[PDB]
Every structure is written in C-alpha cells, then in structure tokens.
Amino acid sequence: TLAVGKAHLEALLATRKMTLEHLQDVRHDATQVYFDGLEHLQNVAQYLAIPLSEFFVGQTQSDLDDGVKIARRNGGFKREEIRGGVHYYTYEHLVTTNQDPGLMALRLDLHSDDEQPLRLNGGHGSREIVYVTRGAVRVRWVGDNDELKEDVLNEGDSIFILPNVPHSFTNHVGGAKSEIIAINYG
Amino acid sequence: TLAVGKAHLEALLATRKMTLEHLQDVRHDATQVYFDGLEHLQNVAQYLAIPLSEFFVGQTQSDLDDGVKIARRNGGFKREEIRGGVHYYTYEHLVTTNQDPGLMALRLDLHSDDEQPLRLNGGHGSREIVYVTRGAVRVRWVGDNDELKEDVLNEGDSIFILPNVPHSFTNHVGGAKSEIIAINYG
Amino acid sequence: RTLAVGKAHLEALLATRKMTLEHLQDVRHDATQVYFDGLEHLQNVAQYLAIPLSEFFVGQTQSDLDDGVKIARRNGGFKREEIRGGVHYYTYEHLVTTNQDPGLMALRLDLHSDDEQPLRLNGGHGSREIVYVTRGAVRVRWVGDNDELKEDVLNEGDSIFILPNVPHSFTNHVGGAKSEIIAINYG
Amino acid sequence: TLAVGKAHLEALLATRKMTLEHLQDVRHDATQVYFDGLEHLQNVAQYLAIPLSEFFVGQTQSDLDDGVKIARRNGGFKREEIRGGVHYYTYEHLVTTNQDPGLMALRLDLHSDDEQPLRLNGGHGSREIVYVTRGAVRVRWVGDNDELKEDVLNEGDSIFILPNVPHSFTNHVGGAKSEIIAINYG
Ligand SMILES: C[C@H](O)CP(=O)(O)O
Ligand SMILES: C[C@H](O)CP(=O)(O)O
Ligand SMILES: C[C@H](O)CP(=O)(O)O
Ligand SMILES: C[C@H](O)CP(=O)(O)O
Numbered sequence: 052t053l054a055v056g057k058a059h060l061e062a063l064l065a066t067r068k069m070t071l072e073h074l075q076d077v078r079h080d081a082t083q084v085y086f087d088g089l090e091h092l093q094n095v096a097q098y099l100a101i102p103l104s105e106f107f108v109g110q111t112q113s114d115l116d117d118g119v120k121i122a123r124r125n126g127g128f129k130r131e132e133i134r135g136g137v138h139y140y141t142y143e144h145l146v147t148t149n150q151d152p153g154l155m156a157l158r159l160d161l162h163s164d165d166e167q168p169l170r171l172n173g174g175h176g177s178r179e180i181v182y183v184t185r186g187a188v189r190v191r192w193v194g195d196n197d198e199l200k201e202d203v204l205n206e207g208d209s210i211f212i213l214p215n216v217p218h219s220f221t222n223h224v225g226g227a228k229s230e231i232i233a234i235n236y237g
Numbered sequence: 238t239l240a241v242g243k244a245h246l247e248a249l250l251a252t253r254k255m256t257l258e259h260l261q262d263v264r265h266d267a268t269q270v271y272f273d274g275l276e277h278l279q280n281v282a283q284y285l286a287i288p289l290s291e292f293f294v295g296q297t298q299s300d301l302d303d304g305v306k307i308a309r310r311n312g313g314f315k316r317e318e319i320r321g322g323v324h325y326y327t328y329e330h331l332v333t334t335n336q337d338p339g340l341m342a343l344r345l346d347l348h349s350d351d352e353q354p355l356r357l358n359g360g361h362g363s364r365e366i367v368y369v370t371r372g373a374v375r376v377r378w379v380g381d382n383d384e385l386k387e388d389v390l391n392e393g394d395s396i397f398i399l400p401n402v403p404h405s406f407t408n409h410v411g412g413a414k415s416e417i418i419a420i421n422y423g
Numbered sequence: 424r425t426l427a428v429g430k431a432h433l434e435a436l437l438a439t440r441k442m443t444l445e446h447l448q449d450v451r452h453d454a455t456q457v458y459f460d461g462l463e464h465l466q467n468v469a470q471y472l473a474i475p476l477s478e479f480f481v482g483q484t485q486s487d488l489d490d491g492v493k494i495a496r497r498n499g500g501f502k503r504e505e506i507r508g509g510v511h512y513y514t515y516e517h518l519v520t521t522n523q524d525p526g527l528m529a530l531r532l533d534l535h536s537d538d539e540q541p542l543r544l545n546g547g548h549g550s551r552e553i554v555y556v557t558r559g560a561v562r563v564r565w566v567g568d569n570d571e572l573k574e575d576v577l578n579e580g581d582s583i584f585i586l587p588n589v590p591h592s593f594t595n596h597v598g599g600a601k602s603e604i605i606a607i608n609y610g
Numbered sequence: 611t612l613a614v615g616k617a618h619l620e621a622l623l624a625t626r627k628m629t630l631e632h633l634q635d636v637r638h639d640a641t642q643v644y645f646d647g648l649e650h651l652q653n654v655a656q657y658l659a660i661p662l663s664e665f666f667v668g669q670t671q672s673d674l675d676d677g678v679k680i681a682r683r684n685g686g687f688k689r690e691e692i693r694g695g696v697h698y699y700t701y702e703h704l705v706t707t708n709q710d711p712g713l714m715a716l717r718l719d720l721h722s723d724d725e726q727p728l729r730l731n732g733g734h735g736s737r738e739i740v741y742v743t744r745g746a747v748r749v750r751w752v753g754d755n756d757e758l759k760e761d762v763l764n765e766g767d768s769i770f771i772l773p774n775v776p777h778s779f780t781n782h783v784g785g786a787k788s789e790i791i792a793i794n795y796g
C-alpha cells in the first residue's frame with residue numbers, strides 16, 4: 052500500500068481535466084489516495100500520461116527546521132578517495148538538504164602531490180567554487196584546446212570551475228597537507 | 238521488489254560523492270539495483286538527502302515511437318463539462334505524452350452563450366494559447382483590478398492567456414456552436 | 424547613444440555584489456533611471472561587476488499584454504512563404520506572439536508539397552512541437568530510431584507530438600489537395 | 611552604434627521563422643549586425659516579440675581563463691558594513707564571474723556581538739550556505755511564525771538558509787573575532 056497526497060493527486064488529475072472519479076478502483080480518505088503498490092501507481096501514471104516521478108515531486112518532507120539546516124564538524128558522511136593507486140582526497144560532507152539536492156558542499160583534505168601521478172577527474176555538470184582554508188594547493192585543469200594548465204592557490208585564494216572542466220587539487224609542497232572547501236551547485 | 242536503473246542510481250550516488258558500496262544492503266546486476274520495496278528506497282533517499290522523486294526522474298518508459306507520438310480524433314479521453322447546471326464545454330484530449338506532462342492540448346466544443354450565466358474558471362498555473370477553428374467565440378476574463386473584460390474571436394484568431402488569469406470561452410452568437418483548440422504548456 | 428537602465432533594477436544587481444550606486448561614481452541618474460554615456464560605458468560597468476550585459480535588461484522589457492492577455496487576428500501579423508530546394512513547402516502564418524513567452528511560436532501553416540516533389544526535411548529544432556490538423560489529409564515524415572525514415576498519415580482532428588531535434592516534414596497526402604495544420608512550438 | 615553577433619541574431623530570427631531579410635534597413639558584416647542605437651534594437655525586439663535581454667544573452671566575453679577563474683586573498687572588492695551605527699561585517703569578495711552572475715561568494719569578518727544591538731537583514735532571493743573557518747559564531751534568524759531563532763556555530767560547522775529568511779551572524783564570545791565563508795547562489 053502506497054499513499055499519495057490527495058490534493059497533489061487532484062492537481063495532477065486537473066492537468067488532464069480529470070477528477071478522482073475518473074480513476075478506476077482507488078480508495079481514498081480526506082487527505083490521501085491509496086494504491087495497491089507501485090505497479091498500480093505506475094499504471095495510473097501511464098493512464099494519465101504523466102511520468103511516475105511527478106506523483107512524488109514535492110512530496111518528500113523538508114529536512115529544514117524553521118527555514119534553515121545546520122551541520123556539525125564530523126557529524127555526517129566522510130570517505131577516502133583513491134585514484135589509480137593514489138590517495139587523493141578525504142571528502143567530508145558539510146550541510147546537505149533535500150531542499151536543494153544539487154548543492155554538494157565539501158571539506159577536503161588533500162593527500163597527493165607532484166611525486167604521485169596526476170589524477171584528473173572527467174569534469175562534472177555542477178559548477179564549483181573552491182576556497183583554500185589551509186596550506187598551499189596545486190590546482191591543475193584542462194583548458195582551451197585540451198592544453199593542461201596549472202596554478203597555485205594559497206590560503207584565502209579561491210577558484211571557480213566551469214561545468215565539465217576536468218580538474219585536480221593536490222599539495223603544492225610534497226608531504227604538507229592542505230585543506231579546501233568546495234561547493235558544487237546548480 | 239523495486240528495481241532502479243544502475244547507471245541512474247550511480248549518477249545520483251555520485252552527486253553525493255558515493256558509490257554502490259556505500260549502500261551495503263542492496264543487490265544489483267549489470268543494469269539494475271534492487272530494493273525491498275518502496276519503504277527501502279525511501280530510506281536510501283533520506284540517507285542521501287535526495288527526494289524520492291529523483292530516483293524516478295527519467296525512468297518511466299517513453300511513450301513515443303521513434304521520437305513522435307500520434308493521436309487520432311476521438312481516440313482518447315473525452316468528457317462533457319457542466320458548471321452550475323450549464324453545459325459549458327466538451328473536452329477532447331489531443332495527443333498526450335509522458336515526455337511532457339505539462340503539455341495539455343485540447344479540442345473543445347463550446348455549448349454556452351449569453352443566455353446562460355457566466356462560468357469562469359479560477360485560472361491555472363499553465364500558460365495557454367487558444368486558436369479558433371470554427372465559428373465565433375466570446376471570450377471573457379478577469380483583467381487588471383479585477384474588472385471583467387470581454388472580446389470576440391473569429392475563425393483563425395488566437396489568444397494568449399497569462400497564468401492564473403480566470404477565463405471563459407462561449408458562443409458569441411447563441412445557438413451557434415463554435416470550436417477552439419487550446420494548448421496549455423510550461 | 425545614451426542607455427538608460429532602471430534604477431531599482433540596477434540597484435538590485437549592485438546588491439548582488441554588496442554594492443550601491445556610490446561604487447559607480449561616473450553615472451548620472453533620476454528617481455527611476457540611471458544613464459550611461461553609451462554601450463561601451465555600460466559594458467565597462469558590467470565587467471567591473473562581473474555580470475554579463477544581458478542581465479542589465481532582464482525583466483526590463485514592457486509587457487505586450489493587455490489585462491493579462493493578448494489577441495491576434497487572422498492575417499493580422501507576419502506571414503511568409505517557405506521554399507526549400509525550389510519546392511514550395513509551407514505558408515507560415517504567425518498566430519499570437521508575445522514577449523512574455525518568446526519561446527512560444529504558434530503557427531498556422533498551408534501545405535503546398537506532396538509525393539511528386541522531393542522530400543525537404545528540416546534538421547529538427549530545440550522546441551517541442553505539437554501539431555493539429557485543421558483541414559485535409561497530411562503526410563508526416565520524420566527520422567526515427569537508428570536514422571530510419573518513418574511516415575504516417577494524419578487526418579482532420581488528428582495530432583502529433585514531436586520530441587526536440589527530431590527532423591520532420593509535413594506535406595499533402597493526396598497531391599493537389601491542400602491541407603492546413605496548426606503547429607505550436609514551445610519550451 | 612550597437613553591434614549584435616550575426617549567428618546569434620539569426621538564431622533569434624529563426625525562432626520567429628525569419629531571416630535577416632525580414633528586418634528593415636540593417637547593415638551587417640560576415641560576423642556582426644549593426645543598429646542605430648538602443649532605441650533601434652528595442653524596436654526590432656518589439657517587432658520580434660522577444661525581450662531585449664535575449665539579444666545580449668551569451669554575448670558578453672567570458673572572464674574565465676581556460677575554463678576557470680582564480681581570485682587571490684585581498685585581490686578584489688572589499689568593504690566594511692555598518693548597520694545602525696554598529697560595525698557588523700567586513701565583506702571580501704571571493705572569486706566572481708560573469709559566467710554565473712547569481713554566485714556571490716564572500717569571506718566575512720564578524721565585528722558585532724551580544725553587547726551591540728541585533729541587525730538582521732531582510733533576507734534575499736539567493737539560497738545561502740555558510741561555513742565557519744574560525745571562531746564561534748552566533749547565528750540568528752526569523753523562523754516559522756516570525757519567531758526569532760538562534761544557535762551557535764563552531765569552527766567547521768555549516769548552515770543552509772532558505773531564500774528570504776532574514777539572518778545575522780555575530781561573535782558568540784564578544785571581543786573574539788570570527789571568520790565565515792558565505793556562498794549565495796542560484
Ligand atoms: C575538489 C574537486 O573538485 C573534487 P572532485 O570533483 O574531483 O571530487
Ligand atoms: C479553454 C479553457 O482554457 C478551458 P478551461 O481552463 O476553463 O478548462
Ligand atoms: C510544421 C513544421 O514543424 C514546420 P518547420 O519546423 O519544418 O518550419
Ligand atoms: C553572511 C550574511 O549572509 C551576509 P548578508 O547577506 O547580511 O550581507
């Protein structure tokens with residue numbers, strides 16, 4: 052048994068000039084409408100020619116409290132990142148929210164340097180802005196005409212990276228261990 | 238058992254810097270990942286802080302054939318519309334597709350006129366464009382400062398209606414029976 | 424050469440950078456507008472703010488609607504013949520157009536070609552399209568899966584939806600008959 | 611004289627099923643099209659029923675260098691913020707780009723505390739995420755039913771703020787001087 056909010060379902064129905072009465076075999080109460088499982092809701096979605104996802108758009112409960120959400124150091128997800136055989140990053144999630152799933156804010160420790168081989172990613176859809184909280188960071192990316200570029204970012208410097216530009220952050224000084232903040236969004 | 242496409246789920250996981258390994262309680266094959274029901278996929282969504290709807294976005298099978306979908310006169314949904322005892326419209330769905338659930342294209346017969354009372358709707362989120370295929374149509378709507386407006390649209394005339402502007406289409410002549418095409422979108 | 428920009432709007436752009444009019448010294452203004460000596464001047468201000476020039480005009484065009492609506496009349500607006508490789512294919516008549524949705528292009532078309540003339544598919548387009556047949560019998564052809572050419576026939580009151588970038592052609596099924604369709608591109 | 615890129619103008623013209631030939635008295639080159647001033651381009655835009663802004667979309671030269679843009683500490687705009695006589699913030703712009711004018715990344719020094727009066731902003735359209743680089747930060751905001759809320763954010767904590775929620779960041783301790791990073795976006 053799968054419940055869908057009644058007002059929401061009625062709104063979808065109204066996009067097709069319909070009402071609950073035009074659905075075959077559904078029970079409902081004053082706030083919900085009930086389906087005999089996912090296959091049943093899938094069939095109703097085909098009947099309305101609306102993809103299944105729409106039946107859930109907006110229907111997840113907000114994880115904010117009073118318009119805001121707070122996270123604490125080490126309070127959430129954390130993970131090492133190893134590329135080819137090279138320890139490259141420690142990813143720590145900052146605050147994350149279902150009210151903007153495209154926002155991924157991270158604190159990273161950098162573990163590689165010039166003595167290890169380069170491990171560029173393939174770029175990604177998200178824009179990114181990085182701020183250096185500590186140390187000295189070697190940044191490398193693939194620029195115009197596939198030519199490799201590099202620079203060095205010191206504490207308090209920052210960088211914006213256009214979507215799908217491949218990039219790497221490493222320690223400028225080998226054995227030193229820098230920290231950056233990275234916000235992907237939009 | 239609920240299957241989610243593997244490449245899609247892996248893409249969502251990557252927006253959180255995760256991989257299948259960070260969900261330990263899931264089986265998978267070369268193209269799908271399997272959940273013990275909706276409650277299970279809902280828990281994984283809360284863990285990822287991504288709303289459930291995202292796990293279905295794009296995952297409904299397209300109802301198009303070779304990039305296109307065709308509908309036939311009288312082939313689909315059709316309904317009379319009666320407002321406070323007044324026969325106002327016949328709604329006939331034109332082609333509808335799950336590849337744009339926000340598109341509602343209609344053919345309407347108009348059945349009311351000046352001898353019946355006015356039955357405006359409450360407006361709606363969709364933009365609308367209407368084209369008169371046949372006859373002469375009295376259009377009325379609520380304009381600036383809630384003042385009622387009216388005009389007449391002849392064959393081949395058209396009108397654009399901003400979202401949430403309440404409106405009514407009726408026969409200008411009375412006993413004459415006009416036809417319009419109405420496209421709500423976006 | 425003088426370029427006016429709405430003052431409230433410019434001030435809102437300035438506030439996205441934590442600035443005020445005072446951080447641009449070389450500008451005259453009234454209670455509602457701010458004036459630039461020319462485009463090069465506004466361009467420099469845009470560079471200084473790291474905001475593209477287009478933003479200075481976003482939202483600033485006066486609505487062409489009257490009381491939330493806009494009406495167009497048969498033959499009241501733009502109209503044009505479409506000839507493809509020497510083949511007279513379409514007559515395009517604009518239905519209502521509005522600056523409040525520039526991506527909405529609603530057309531009435533006459534079809535002038537048929538099976539005796541060569542095929543003239545377009546290259547497809549970004550817009551979604553829905554077509555409704557007002558009159559006659561219409562041969563529709565498009566490029567489907569694996570670049571295979573597809574075809575069908577649409578009668579009066581039939582309709583079709585076309586996914587973005589699917590190449591397509593509408594012609595007369597019968598030949599010498601002359602059909603009419605309504606085509607709405609949007610989004 | 612206003613020049614507009616020719617390929618671009620042609621693409622706009624094609625959205626209206628037009629070509630350069632349908633425009634009255636315009637000169638052009640192999641790459642540009644020329645207008646007798648803004649009023650002229652404004653009239654062409656009314657004729658096409660396309661807002662003026664569209665004629666410049668994409669037409670500003672990117673301020674990125676090879677897909678990236680770098681800013682240095684103290685390299686760009688910087689300003690003190692005083693609210694009703696109270697020194698509240700030092701705003702330092704981090705990297706800014708014309709490729710995303712909705713991104714405003716700041717480094718702030720906090721100068722106020724509990725001994726000074728509260729100076730909330732009015733909120734803003736942008737979402738915000740804040741990360742505490744140094745110290746201990748008193749955050750206050752207006753939540754549900756206009757009730758004032760407060761909390762304390764330590765080094766490495768972060769917060770997400772929904773659009774138009776009014777807020778203030780100040781020093782928790784008093785005479786201590788904290789630092790935050792604040793990213794408004796989207
Ligand atoms: C800081 C980098 O942008 C992180 P990656 O995208 O390679 O995970
Ligand atoms: C043609 C009209 O827009 C139909 P309604 O929205 O009242 O169903
Ligand atoms: C009816 C067709 O969509 C018109 P085209 O897009 O080829 O100009
Ligand atoms: C860090 C805060 O969000 C700065 P404000 O938006 O009041 O200028």
Ligand SMILES: [Mn+2]
Nearest residue numbers: 172175179218
């Ligand atoms: Mn990255």
Ligand SMILES: [Mn+2]
Nearest residue numbers: 361365404419
């Ligand atoms: Mn309507």
Ligand SMILES: [Mn+2]
Nearest residue numbers: 545548552591
């Ligand atoms: Mn087309």
Ligand SMILES: [Mn+2]
Nearest residue numbers: 731734738777
């Ligand atoms: Mn703020």
